[PDB]
Amino acid sequence: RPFSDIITSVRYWVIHSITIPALFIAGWLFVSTGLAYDVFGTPRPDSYYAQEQRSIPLVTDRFAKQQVETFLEQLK
Amino acid sequence: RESANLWERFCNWVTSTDNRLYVGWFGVIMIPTLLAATICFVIAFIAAPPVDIDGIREPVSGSLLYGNNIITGAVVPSSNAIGLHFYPIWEAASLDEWLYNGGPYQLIIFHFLLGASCYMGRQWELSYRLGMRPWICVAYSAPLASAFAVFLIYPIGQGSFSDGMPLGISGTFNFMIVFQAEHNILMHPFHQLGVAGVFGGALFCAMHGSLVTSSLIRETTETESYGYKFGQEEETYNIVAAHGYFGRLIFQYASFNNSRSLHFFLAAWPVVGVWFTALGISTMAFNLNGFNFNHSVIDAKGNVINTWADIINRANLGMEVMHERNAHNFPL
Amino acid sequence: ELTPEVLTVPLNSEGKTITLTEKQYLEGKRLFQYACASCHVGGITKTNPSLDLRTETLALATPPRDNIEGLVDYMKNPTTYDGEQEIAEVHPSLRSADIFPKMRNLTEKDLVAIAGHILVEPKILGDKWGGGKVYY
Amino acid sequence: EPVSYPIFTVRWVAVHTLAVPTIFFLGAIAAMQFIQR
Amino acid sequence: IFATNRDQESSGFAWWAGNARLINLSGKLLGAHVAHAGLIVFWAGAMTLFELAHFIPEKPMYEQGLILIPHIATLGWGVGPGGEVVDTFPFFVVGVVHLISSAVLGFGGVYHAIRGPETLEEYSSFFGYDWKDKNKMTTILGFHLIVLGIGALLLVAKAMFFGGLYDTWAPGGGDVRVITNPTLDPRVIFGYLLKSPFGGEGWIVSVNNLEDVVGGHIWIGLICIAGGIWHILTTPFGWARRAFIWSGEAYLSYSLGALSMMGFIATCFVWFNNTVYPSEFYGPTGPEASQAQAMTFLIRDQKLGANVGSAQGPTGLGKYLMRSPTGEIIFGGETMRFWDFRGPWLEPLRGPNGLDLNKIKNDIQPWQERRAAEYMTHAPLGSLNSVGGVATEINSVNFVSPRSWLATSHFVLAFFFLVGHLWHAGRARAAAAGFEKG
Amino acid sequence: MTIAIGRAPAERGWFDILDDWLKRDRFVFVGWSGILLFPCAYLALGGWLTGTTFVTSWYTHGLASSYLEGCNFLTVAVSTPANSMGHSLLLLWGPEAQGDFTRWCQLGGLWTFIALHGAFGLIGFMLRQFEIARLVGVRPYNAIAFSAPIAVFVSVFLIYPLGQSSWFFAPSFGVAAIFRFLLFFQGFHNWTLNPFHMMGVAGVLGGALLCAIHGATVENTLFQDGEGASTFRAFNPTQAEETYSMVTANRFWSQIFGIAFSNKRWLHFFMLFVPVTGLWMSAIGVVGLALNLRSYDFISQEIRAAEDPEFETFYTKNLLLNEGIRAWMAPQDQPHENFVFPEEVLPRGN
Amino acid sequence: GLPWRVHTVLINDPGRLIAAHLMHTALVAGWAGSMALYELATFDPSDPVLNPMWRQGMFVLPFMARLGVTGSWSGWSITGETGIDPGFWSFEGVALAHIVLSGLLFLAACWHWVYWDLELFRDPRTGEPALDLPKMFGIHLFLAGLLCFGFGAFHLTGLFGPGMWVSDPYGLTGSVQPVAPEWGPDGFNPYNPGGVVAHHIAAGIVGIIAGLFHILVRPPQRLYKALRMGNIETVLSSSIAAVFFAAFVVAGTMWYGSATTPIELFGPTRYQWDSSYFQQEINRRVQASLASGATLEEAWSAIPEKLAFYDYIGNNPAKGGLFRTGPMNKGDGIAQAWKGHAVFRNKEGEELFVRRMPAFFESFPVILTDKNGVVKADIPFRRAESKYSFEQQGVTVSFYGGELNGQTFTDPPTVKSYARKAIFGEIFEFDTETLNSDGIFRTSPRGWFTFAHAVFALLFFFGHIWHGARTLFRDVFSG
Numbered sequence A: 001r002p003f004s005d006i007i008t009s010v011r012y013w014v015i016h017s018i019t020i021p022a023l024f025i026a027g028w029l030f031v032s033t034g035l036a037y038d039v040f041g042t043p044r045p046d047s048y049y050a051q052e053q054r055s056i057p058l059v060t061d062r063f064a065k066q067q068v069e070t071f072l073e074q075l076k
Numbered sequence B: 001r002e003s004a005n006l007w008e009r010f011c012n013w014v015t016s017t018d019n020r021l022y023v024g025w026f027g028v029i030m031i032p033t034l035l036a037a038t039i040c041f042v043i044a045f046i047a048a049p050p051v052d053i054d055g056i057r058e059p060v061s062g063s064l065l066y067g068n069n070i071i072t073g074a075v076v077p078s079s080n081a082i083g084l085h086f087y088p089i090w091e092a093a094s095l096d097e098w099l100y101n102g103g104p105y106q107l108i109i110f111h112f113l114l115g116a117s118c119y120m121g122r123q124w125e126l127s128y129r130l131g132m133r134p135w136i137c138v139a140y141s142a143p144l145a146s147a148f149a150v151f152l153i154y155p156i157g158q159g160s161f162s163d164g165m166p167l168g169i170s171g172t173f174n175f176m177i178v179f180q181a182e183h184n185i186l187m188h189p190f191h192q193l194g195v196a197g198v199f200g201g202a203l204f205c206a207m208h209g210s211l212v213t214s215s216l217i218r219e220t221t222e223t224e225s226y227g228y229k230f231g232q233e234e235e236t237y238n239i240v241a242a243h244g245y246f247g248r249l250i251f252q253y254a255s256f257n258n259s260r261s262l263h264f265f266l267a268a269w270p271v272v273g274v275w276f277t278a279l280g281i282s283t284m285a286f287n288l289n290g291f292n293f294n295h296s297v298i299d300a301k302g303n304v305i306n307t308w309a310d311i312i313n314r315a316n317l318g319m320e321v322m323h324e325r326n327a328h329n330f331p332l
Numbered sequence C: 001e002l003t004p005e006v007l008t009v010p011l012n013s014e015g016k017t018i019t020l021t022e023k024q025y026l027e028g029k030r031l032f033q034y035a036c037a038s039c040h041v042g043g044i045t046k047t048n049p050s051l052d053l054r055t056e057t058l059a060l061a062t063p064p065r066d067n068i069e070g071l072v073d074y075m076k077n078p079t080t081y082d083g084e085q086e087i088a089e090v091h092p093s094l095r096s097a098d099i100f101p102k103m104r105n106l107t108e109k110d111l112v113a114i115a116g117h118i119l120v121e122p123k124i125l126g127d128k129w130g131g132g133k134v135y136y
Numbered sequence D: 001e002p003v004s005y006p007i008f009t010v011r012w013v014a015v016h017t018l019a020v021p022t023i024f025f026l027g028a029i030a031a032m033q034f035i036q037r
Numbered sequence E: 001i002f003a004t005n006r007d008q009e010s011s012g013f014a015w016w017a018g019n020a021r022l023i024n025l026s027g028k029l030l031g032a033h034v035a036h037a038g039l040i041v042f043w044a045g046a047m048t049l050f051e052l053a054h055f056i057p058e059k060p061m062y063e064q065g066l067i068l069i070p071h072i073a074t075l076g077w078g079v080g081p082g083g084e085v086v087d088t089f090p091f092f093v094v095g096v097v098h099l100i101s102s103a104v105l106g107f108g109g110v111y112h113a114i115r116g117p118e119t120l121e122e123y124s125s126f127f128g129y130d131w132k133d134k135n136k137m138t139t140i141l142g143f144h145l146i147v148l149g150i151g152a153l154l155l156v157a158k159a160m161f162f163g164g165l166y167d168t169w170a171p172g173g174g175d176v177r178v179i180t181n182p183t184l185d186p187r188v189i190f191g192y193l194l195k196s197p198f199g200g201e202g203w204i205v206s207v208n209n210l211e212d213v214v215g216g217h218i219w220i221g222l223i224c225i226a227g228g229i230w231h232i233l234t235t236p237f238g239w240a241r242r243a244f245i246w247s248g249e250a251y252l253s254y255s256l257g258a259l260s261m262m263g264f265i266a267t268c269f270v271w272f273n274n275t276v277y278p279s280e281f282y283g284p285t286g287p288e289a290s291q292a293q294a295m296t297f298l299i300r301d302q303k304l305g306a307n308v309g310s311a312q313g314p315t316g317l318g319k320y321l322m323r324s325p326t327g328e329i330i331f332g333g334e335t336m337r338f339w340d341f342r343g344p345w346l347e348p349l350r351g352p353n354g355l356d357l358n359k360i361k362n363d364i365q366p367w368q369e370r371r372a373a374e375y376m377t378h379a380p381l382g383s384l385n386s387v388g389g390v391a392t393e394i395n396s397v398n399f400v401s402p403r404s405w406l407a408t409s410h411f412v413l414a415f416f417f418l419v420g421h422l423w424h425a426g427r428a429r430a431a432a433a434g435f436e437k438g
Numbered sequence F: 001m002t003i004a005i006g007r008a009p010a011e012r013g014w015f016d017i018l019d020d021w022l023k024r025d026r027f028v029f030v031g032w033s034g035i036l037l038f039p040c041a042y043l044a045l046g047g048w049l050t051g052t053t054f055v056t057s058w059y060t061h062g063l064a065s066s067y068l069e070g071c072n073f074l075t076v077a078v079s080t081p082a083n084s085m086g087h088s089l090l091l092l093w094g095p096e097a098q099g100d101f102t103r104w105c106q107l108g109g110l111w112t113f114i115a116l117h118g119a120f121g122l123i124g125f126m127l128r129q130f131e132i133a134r135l136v137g138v139r140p141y142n143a144i145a146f147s148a149p150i151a152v153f154v155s156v157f158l159i160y161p162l163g164q165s166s167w168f169f170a171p172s173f174g175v176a177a178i179f180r181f182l183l184f185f186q187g188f189h190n191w192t193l194n195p196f197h198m199m200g201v202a203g204v205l206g207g208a209l210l211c212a213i214h215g216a217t218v219e220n221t222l223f224q225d226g227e228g229a230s231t232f233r234a235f236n237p238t239q240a241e242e243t244y245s246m247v248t249a250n251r252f253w254s255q256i257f258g259i260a261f262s263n264k265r266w267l268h269f270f271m272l273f274v275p276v277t278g279l280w281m282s283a284i285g286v287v288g289l290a291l292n293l294r295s296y297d298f299i300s301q302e303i304r305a306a307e308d309p310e311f312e313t314f315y316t317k318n319l320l321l322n323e324g325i326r327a328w329m330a331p332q333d334q335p336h337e338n339f340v341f342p343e344e345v346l347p348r349g350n
Numbered sequence G: 001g002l003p004w005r006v007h008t009v010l011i012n013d014p015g016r017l018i019a020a021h022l023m024h025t026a027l028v029a030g031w032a033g034s035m036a037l038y039e040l041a042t043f044d045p046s047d048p049v050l051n052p053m054w055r056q057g058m059f060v061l062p063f064m065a066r067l068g069v070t071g072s073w074s075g076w077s078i079t080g081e082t083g084i085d086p087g088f089w090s091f092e093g094v095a096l097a098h099i100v101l102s103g104l105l106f107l108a109a110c111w112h113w114v115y116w117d118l119e120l121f122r123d124p125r126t127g128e129p130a131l132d133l134p135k136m137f138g139i140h141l142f143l144a145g146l147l148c149f150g151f152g153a154f155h156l157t158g159l160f161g162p163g164m165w166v167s168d169p170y171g172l173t174g175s176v177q178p179v180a181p182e183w184g185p186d187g188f189n190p191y192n193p194g195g196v197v198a199h200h201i202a203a204g205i206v207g208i209i210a211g212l213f214h215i216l217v218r219p220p221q222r223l224y225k226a227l228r229m230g231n232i233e234t235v236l237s238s239s240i241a242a243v244f245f246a247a248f249v250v251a252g253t254m255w256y257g258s259a260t261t262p263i264e265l266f267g268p269t270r271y272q273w274d275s276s277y278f279q280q281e282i283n284r285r286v287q288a289s290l291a292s293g294a295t296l297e298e299a300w301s302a303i304p305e306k307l308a309f310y311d312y313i314g315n316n317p318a319k320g321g322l323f324r325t326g327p328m329n330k331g332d333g334i335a336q337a338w339k340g341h342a343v344f345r346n347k348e349g350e351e352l353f354v355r356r357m358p359a360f361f362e363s364f365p366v367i368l369t370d371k372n373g374v375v376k377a378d379i380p381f382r383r384a385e386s387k388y389s390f391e392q393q394g395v396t397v398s399f400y401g402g403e404l405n406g407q408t409f410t411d412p413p414t415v416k417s418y419a420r421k422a423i424f425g426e427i428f429e430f431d432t433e434t435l436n437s438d439g440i441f442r443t444s445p446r447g448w449f450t451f452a453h454a455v456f457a458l459l460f461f462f463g464h465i466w467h468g469a470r471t472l473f474r475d476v477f478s479g
């Protein structure tokens, strides 16, 4: 079908060969840093529980949920 | 003689009748094989003595006259004791022993297959008997597989027809459940592809039929118613418009030769999807279960953090924990 | 987490302790899966359920097996729960390394780590290690 | 008529809004693969 | 006439059917066929070495997802009372052999798809187928049954006139060786036819006597060499002639199912049999495994003091004996079924009606306990991642059983090839009429 | 008595009439329908990917649900809000906004996000088939078929939860978390006994059936015409004549299965009828289970079974499994409540 | 669708189609009054406190009730018842009332079919002319409106007064009162009747304005060309989507919300039970009496009896469906008075509470935990190797309050059976025969009504998506 010119463009290669890894690396950094973590709030292996009581907290809571979550996270 | 002369030449020409018746030839096996079983099934299902399906002495009764309705089981599987042995209806002076040891089951089974197997064989003769092209034959090679799995393979895999799907609605419902707690199937590619296959096929069938009719436208018616218207021429639908709408909806479409390729694609997607699922089982029979992702850990300590796949287990467990008592021791 | 209490277990029955290193912890998991999981997976005991590796159970064994030394001793010269009869011909051990090949390659260090795994795991898994709660 | 030297093509719009993101994760993920704790 | 070539339009078939093309061009196929061949030779070597590498001694083969090694073992190498890795060298040998023995092919394979007469015528050587000359077809095949024929004999020799073919009997292990047986008776024939498968017884798939297998192959190596000789001699006959159609693809189909069948036979022979497939090398065979579970608990329990013979399970069957138915015894549960088991350890404890409440009560040596304890713990199962076981369971081991991977793939294969058979034989039957468408 | 108009042709004067032309061009079909489909679809396809690899469940369930947390395609998932939160569209604004978008994630906004948006996206796509179908001058029968799936989708994602408190018992948009839903049902609502789904099955499985006959029939019934030997993929899509041939098909079946109906103009409808239908049926089915109206009790036999302890049907066995699943599965599942089922938990035997 | 058938036829127518329609009307009021009579020759006035429509159942009844009708001869009500018575023209009458008018319709449907125618128508134218629609959907809306309006002012609001069913939480009181408311408131909340009445008054007038307008100011070519307007199909799918929508919401409020879905006239709602509602109300009821004077025992018882009943699982729409018847009866049996909850105690009497049944499950076990979740005693399944056996007891299965106040049982079974029953609401005494009663729970109107209406609402989608098709697409339907 269509799409085989640009991919065979050569200039395309230029523009993207510079852009793609550029992106691939930004995320790989967004992941390594922690934003990935701190924005999506997911727990780093380190933060599950608190080594002194389990309760997969809930939540429970609620409200008041949030406020509740906050404390939860904090105490953790 | 009688068997002798042109008679034969004539006989041969009739079966041949173408457308115318219804058927013909293959039927010469299919036909009779299938009648025995169909008949054995009907009678057992309408009325027959509880079967010692399990390896023990707690007779299950899936037949109608002994306290059933259609949804509640059919002909329960041979005994865990006969296991793999060949238990016709000769062995033992009494037939009453046959019913008990759940013998009717093996009759049906062995015949059905052997028949539906011939059915696949005959399924192609009338091809090579009207100019037709084979293939359709292999299309039926997909369900036959799935049937040898559930009746020969699995048992030959685990040592006894005793296990491996019973005739009738519930009996299947059993088979099915049990088995998933025993292999996490849902977590096995080969089933997955079976679902994509089947789930898809319907999906596709919807479309072909859908777009066709929508053409156609043419217217016738117014318112008222338508258816018716138717026847063858001329055609009744006339492609182009179809393509002119489909393409417009999803994007630009392409294949070897529309209709000629827009039909092969139908003929295979489900077929291969189901195929693997025939294997998938034949696989899990000789025992090689689906995936098992039970433990990811918080390795900051080792306490284990769950995962949607843990629950899957919890349930499979309480499914494993009961089942037969049967078973015783340690475991299985 | 691999905190002090978690890695610190009783060395002997006299009250002496030892704080296992993280590398001893990892080696322990490895070695335990290599020579013990076939039958003690998750802390249970296959050929004989009641005799699990739960710390309390070990503590009531004879002699006490709820310490490094005691377990080490067990891997060398296993006994019934009352300690009245040696059972190396059924239970893998250094003494029965000829019929239990996997025991041939275990060093004193190895035996210590394996023992450490047994005493630490329950502090991480909790009941799950005993009779398998999450596992049963 | 796409492909032939425009660039103000919506086709380009979608084509990338799927692209960029993916690449962004496709890496993000290969990055997580390396995690221990 | 003129110079060869032409991939498409002319040729027909289109790509992804870039093989049918070679159906006509003897030479071209020769190497297609040669290379491929080596390609397996290759694999063979590639794997043994890729096996050995990751192979720790006295640490159970089956426990190391080892598909290949075990084979060698059986034959009568790397033995010592009941697998004792005496001589991991033989393993490195078969390795190189093939890996080299392959390039040898590879060259002379790639050597027919690029020059050579084609181829154518161538012368013677161348073839044819068959169209032009239904006889060479015959003479070639037959000129092969010798090859296939001779092979057998090699086994028997190795086994007896050479350094044995390890037997899991006597015783244990061982081996032985053986011786054979086989031779034885047949009776080798009676075995089929018745046975169934179923149950147990159952078957085979029963055959235990290492002798029977050895002395039996004899018959085959002979059996088929005779045929390869007789076949050459003439053109088929007049029913054979009228009954079969004749074409590359037809033959294909013909010999395409030839495998699917054996193929199945394969999967079974493994998963069930045990002699040809020791277990000191492979796994413990599901049937057996579900059975050592009895030994261990009747053993464990009778070791606590419950009289086995009168013990009565929930059903009210035989908790120990159971027873078965027838018755036986055995064992049971549920091991109710594999009471067709039979095999080493469990044998001694036997007698006329099977399993002597007397032997069992006291005449069971302490190695069967361990072995039976090992098997069930092994198985097989597983898951894938693988782890193993269950499913549930958791964490531890891883690891899954070798005895199942082997039997897992083959069905898949045997099966498909049956799709193949039909598919490839309903077309051959459509060209043979002018159908296609218408 | 005016059977006609108000004021002349157009729409909102200047624009629309104009705007229509623009939005309806010819490169990868946009359209008004798309003006409201795309945002959604994408917006909603993304949402899932985000959680898949970036967001957790922990606070809502207590399961790791993303690649980042350690999951993998299958095990990964976009969990449901906590039951604590019942039925809220959980807009990024109710349970506080600005503070934590993060927390929106935590509590579970990414769900409704995918639910509500995809909902509209599905509404969108149906239109993007109506816009187009009408323009090209072809029958909307493709949209009827599509009404089916939407139904399947409105019962299991919107209705159900409105029945059994809080989305949460709604599938979690997870490869593996759907299986929990499956099993959960089997053991809890005993779907099998449901004549309604039972039906559905027949449709889907049977739609797949028809799809593989026809297809196989066609290719196998084809003509020599447009020959060139092997690789017979040369039918002039230019137009004209049948490619395959009914008669031959017909004679075949007739001598084989004993029912070979003619009228492709029926074969392609029957092909639509089946799946579409089946899903609507099975759809009603779940709308039912949405109010716990289910099966799990023939009633005529659980009575006849409490007298005859020597009564046994594949029906009662399945009823047993169902209970084992509830007892063991529970407390890991829904922390909504405290569940601590001591070891006297419904096992038996092994 | 295509194929188918147718128816247508009717348608438109028009004429004949109107016949078709005149007839279908007749069939409902035929049914309408007809149901009532069924319900009527079976209705259990015996005790509204425990054997209510408702329970028982008713079905039909509820409505007749709520909108203002509560009684007949024998001379009973609620318502018352016582017686019552017154018525004067209630139940009995509403029913007959419909049999008559359902017949006039029929007959009307008759001469309106022989004459088309014338116316328707125218012128311118012549034628136728299909009719003219825009005038219709203008004039009809005028009436509909005027009507909506009426209902609001003159009915709900009072003055011709028979209002509606009002009642303060937990049922108990409640009745038809002016218603018222008304308206315014500002309360839009679905419970505060207030809304009910204001809504209609406003909508009503809004109706009149909108209608008259729609019948006095024609439809733009564009809007008229847009919806194929002028060819009934479109009118249909347009209204069907609107019933389709009307329906769906209705199903919703009957399952949750109220004041058009009242506790007494129709089931408690699963939601009240999920929330352990009532019981907290019982707790405050006694706790105060309990301590404050117152014582213891017582308180409781105281407591008622009525609340004690609104607990219990057999009444939660669950469931179942088928089952059936009755209920709400073949399952439970007939509601024969209350036995007062009991307070299962330990060998020391650590109060011990029983873990309620989720209304999601069926096969639920008895846990009985300390006043803090500690498992103080939980009936086994595997007696071997089993602790917490009930030995210590719960023997304090001692009851407090109605028909059993002050009266303990130490016997392990009665103690134990009693728990098994405690496992789901306040324990009541039941009449089993006289209806045979299977022993298995069965939903209620609140549950059924909300099962049909949702299904119906959902099937009419395929109604819209399809008819509207013919609308926008007529030429091709032939294609």
Ligand SMILES: [Fe+2]
Binding pocket: B208, B212, B263, F214, F218, F268
């Ligand atoms: Fe078609």
Ligand SMILES: [Mn+2]
Binding pocket: B162, B163, B324
């Ligand atoms: Mn079984």
Ligand SMILES: [Mn+2]
Binding pocket: B332
């Ligand atoms: Mn089992």
Ligand SMILES: [Mn+2]
Binding pocket: B332, E334
């Ligand atoms: Mn089993």
Ligand SMILES: [Mn+2]
Binding pocket: B163, B324
């Ligand atoms: Mn089993």
